[PDB]
Design an enzyme around this catalytic site. Structure first.
Site, short mmCIF file in Angstrom:
data_model
loop_
_atom_site.label_atom_id
_atom_site.label_comp_id
_atom_site.label_asym_id
_atom_site.label_seq_id
_atom_site.Cartn_x
_atom_site.Cartn_y
_atom_site.Cartn_z
N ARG A 115 -45.91 -58.69 -54.00
CA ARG A 115 -44.45 -58.83 -54.09
C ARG A 115 -43.74 -57.49 -54.21
O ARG A 115 -42.53 -57.45 -54.44
CB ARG A 115 -44.04 -59.74 -55.26
N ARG A 235 -22.31 -50.54 -42.84
CA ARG A 235 -23.65 -50.17 -42.40
C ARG A 235 -23.91 -50.66 -40.98
O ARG A 235 -24.76 -50.13 -40.28
CB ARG A 235 -24.72 -50.71 -43.36
N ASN A 239 -25.66 -49.27 -36.32
CA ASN A 239 -26.30 -49.92 -35.17
C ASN A 239 -25.64 -49.52 -33.84
O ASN A 239 -25.91 -50.13 -32.81
CB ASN A 239 -26.25 -51.44 -35.32
N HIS A 246 -31.91 -51.81 -28.29
CA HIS A 246 -33.04 -52.65 -28.68
C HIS A 246 -33.53 -53.59 -27.60
O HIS A 246 -34.70 -53.95 -27.57
CB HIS A 246 -32.70 -53.45 -29.93
#
Ligand SMILES: NC(=O)c1ccc[n+]([C@@H]2O[C@H](COP(=O)([O-])OP(=O)(O)OC[C@H]3O[C@@H](n4cnc5c(N)ncnc54)[C@H](O)[C@@H]3O)[C@@H](O)[C@H]2O)c1
Ligand SMILES: O=C(O)[C@]1(O)C[C@H](CP(=O)(O)O)[C@@H](O)[C@H](O)C1
Ligand SMILES: [Cl-]
Ligand SMILES: [Cl-]
Ligand SMILES: [Cl-]
Ligand SMILES: [Cl-]
Ligand SMILES: [Cl-]
Ligand SMILES: [Zn+2]
Length: 353
Positions: A115, A235, A239, A246
Site C-alpha cells: 500500500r 494542473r 497537458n 498521447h
C-alpha cells in the site's frame, strides 16, 4: 539548486545540481531494503557506478525494459511479485534510476507495494525534469497512455545533471519538448526568450544553458503541482499538446517528446479554428525543422485511428474530447472539441507535410 514542495505536510526535496548523485547515500542508509529499478540501457551506461552500493545487499538491482516497454501490467506484476519474494518491510525504498518511463513504472510500484513504500526519484533524462516531479505515476493500457496509475509523492527527487551529458540528440529533442512546453505556459516573453537561445540544432545538441531552462521548467511545474496536486484545476494546463501527443505516441510508438511537439502544433491549429487565434503555424513548424525534429512519419496519420486514443484522454468528459488550448499567450483554456473540428485540425496539420 535545492527546491521543495510546500504542501501542508508530507513534503519532499528536489535536489537539482551537477553531481547530485551524492545525496543518495543518506537515504539508502535509512531504509530496511532498497530496490534500484534501472533502465535496461541506462544500466549498460552506468552499471559500474552501482556495483559498489550493490555490495551491501539490502540494496538490490532490478533491471527493467527500456522506455515504454516497461510501462505494462505484466512488467508491473512481474516486478511486484519479484520484490515481494524478498519479504520486504514498509520501510523499503524504490529508487527509480532513469527517464520518465522508468520513473512512472517504478513509482507505481512504490505506490502499491504494501500500500506504499519509500520512493526516490533519480532522473537521468532532460524530459525527466518534468516527470520526476508531481507524483503522477503509472503504466499504459491497450486503450492508451497512462491509464492505470496514481498520485504518489516521492520521498525525494535527486536530479544529477551530469546524467544529461550522455543523452543522444533524439533524446535531447524528446526532452526539449517539455522544456519548451513550460516556456509556452510561461508566456510570450518566455517562449521567445528560449527560441532566441536554442535557435538551431547546433545549440540544442550542445545543451548550453539547458540547465537554466530545466530549472525554469521545474519551477513552473512545482508551483502548479503544489497549487493543484490532484489536477482539479490549473494542473490540466500541463497537458498542453498531450491530447494529440498521447494519441500519436501510443499508436506510432515515436518518442514521447516528439509526440508532444506534434500535439502542440495540433493544439495551435485547433485554437485558430475555434477562436481564430491567428497562431503563426508556419513559425512553430519552422522552429521544429531547424531543431532537427524528423516529423516525416505524419504523412500517414490516420485521424480515424488516433481519435480512438484521444477518446480515452483522462481530460475528457461525457461530451467527449477535452483539449488544453492556448487561445493566446497567457490565455490558456480547457474545453470540449467536437470530432468534426478535431478531424479538420488533423487533416490540415497533415497538409503542411
Ligand atoms: N508522470 C509524469 O509526471 C510524466 C511527465 C512527463 C512525461 N511522462 C512519461 O515519461 C516518459 C518519457 O520520458 P523519458 O524521455 O525520460 O523516457 P524514457 O524512460 O523512455 O527515456 C528515454 C530514453 O533514454 C535512455 N536514457 C535514459 N537516461 C539516459 C542517459 N542519461 N543517457 C543516455 N540514454 C539515457 C533510456 O534508456 C530511453 O531509451 C513517457 O513514458 C511519458 O508518458 C510522465
Ligand atoms: O500533470 C502533469 O504532471 C502532466 O500534465 C501529466 C502528463 C501525463 P498524463 O496526461 O498521462 O497525466 C505529462 O505527460 C505532462 O507533461 C505533465
Ligand atoms: Cl498535504
Ligand atoms: Cl524537506
Ligand atoms: Cl523482513
Ligand atoms: Cl553520473
Ligand atoms: Cl481552470
Ligand atoms: Zn509529457
Amino acid at each position: 539548486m535545492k527546491l521543495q514542495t510546500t504542501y501542508p505536510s508530507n513534503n519532499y526535496p528536489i535536489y537539482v545540481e551537477h553531481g547530485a548523485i551524492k545525496y543518495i547515500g543518506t537515504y539508502l542508509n535509512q531504509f530496511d531494503q532498497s530496490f534500484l529499478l534501472i533502465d535496461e540501457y541506462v544500466n549498460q551506461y552506468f552499471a559500474n557506478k552501482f556495483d559498489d552500493i550493490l555490495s551491501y545487499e539490502n540494496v538490490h538491482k532490478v533491471i527493467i525494459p527500456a522506455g515504454e516497454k516497461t510501462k505494462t501490467f505484466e512488467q508491473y506484476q512481474e516486478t511486484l511479485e519479484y520484490i515481494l519474494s524478498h519479504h520486504v518491510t514498509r520501510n523499503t525504498a524504490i529508487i527509480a534510476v532513469g527517464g520518465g518511463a522508468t520513473g512512472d513504472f517504478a513509482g507505481f510500484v512504490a505506490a502499491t507495494l504494501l500500500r506504499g513504500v519509500h520512493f526516490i526519484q533519480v532522473p537521468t533524462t532532460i524530459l525527466a525534469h518534468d516527470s520526476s516531479v508531481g507524483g503522477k505515476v503509472g503504466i499504459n493500457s491497450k486503450q492508451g497512455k497512462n491509464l492505470i496509475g496514481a498520485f504518489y509523492r516521492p520521498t525525494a527527487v535527486i536530479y544529477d545533471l551530469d546524467f544529461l551529458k550522455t543523452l543522444p540528440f533524439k533524446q535531447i529533442l524528446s526532452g526539449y519538448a517539455e522544456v519548451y512546453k513550460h516556456a509556452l505556459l510561461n508566456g510570450e516573453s518566455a517562449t521567445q526568450d528560449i527560441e532566441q537561445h536554442f535557435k538551431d540544432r547546433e545549440i540544442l545538441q550542445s545543451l548550453n544553458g539547458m540547465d537554466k531552462y530545466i530549472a525554469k521548467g521545474i519551477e513552473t511545474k512545482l508551483d502548479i503541482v503544489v497549487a493543484d496536486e490532484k489536477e482539479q484545476g490549473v494542473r490540466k494546463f500541463l497537458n498542453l499538446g498531450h491530447t494529440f501527443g498521447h494519441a500519436v505516441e501510443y499508436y506510432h510508438k515515436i518518442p514521447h517528446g516528439h509526440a508532444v511537439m506534434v500535439g502542440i502544433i495540433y493544439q495551435f491549429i485547433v485554437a485558430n479554428a475555434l477562436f481564430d487565434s491567428k497562431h503563426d503555424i508556419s513559425h512553430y513548424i519552422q522552429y521544429l525543422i531547424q531543431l532537427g525534429y524528423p516529423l516525416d512519419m505524419i504523412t500517414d496519420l490516420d485521424f480515424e485511428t488516433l481519435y480512438q486514443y484521444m477518446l480515452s484522454d483522462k481530460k475528457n468528459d461525457k461530451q467527449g474530447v477535452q483539449m488544453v488550448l492556448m487561445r493566446q499567450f497567457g490565455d490558456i483554456v480547457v474545453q470540449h472539441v467536437d470530432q468534426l473540428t478535431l478531424q479538420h485540425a488533423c487533416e490540415q496539420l497533415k497538409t503542411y507535410f
